[PDB]
Amino acid sequence: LVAAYPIVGVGMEKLIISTNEHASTDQGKTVSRATTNSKTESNTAGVSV
Amino acid sequence: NVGYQNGFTANVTTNYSHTTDNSTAVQDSNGESWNTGLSINKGESAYIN
């Protein structure tokens, strides 16, 4: 009269999450040097009284 | 100006003048640079066996 019958079901214990990011670091240095050479030339007149 | 030198004295001076000018310059430059850098992916960040 009674039936042969399996009955199952599942149950949660824990849940773990894990994100998605793309971190980045950079580090730099710099060195420089420059020279300058120049030449000027000027004239002047004038009158006083 | 006014003043006293063997009696009262006074003088009134004017002035005008006009100057011109021109010049050049030449400037070189030279330099170097370095750089490093990383990155990482939080989540899927290591592989095991």
Experimental technique used to determine this entry? cryo-EM
Are A34 and B42 in contact by the 8 Å Cβ rule? The answer is: no
Tokens (6 digits) for B27? 């400037």
B18 touches chain A (CB under 8 A): yes
In whole angstroms, how far apart are CA B1 and each of A47, B6, B9? 19, 16, 8
B17 touches chain A (CB under 8 A): yes
Nearest CA in chain A to B41: A22
Q: Nominal resolution in Å?
A: 3.7
Residue A15, min C-alpha distance to chain B (Å): 15
Beta bridge partners of A27: B36
Beta bridge partners of A34: B29
Q: How many CB atoms lie within 10 A of CB B25?
A: 9
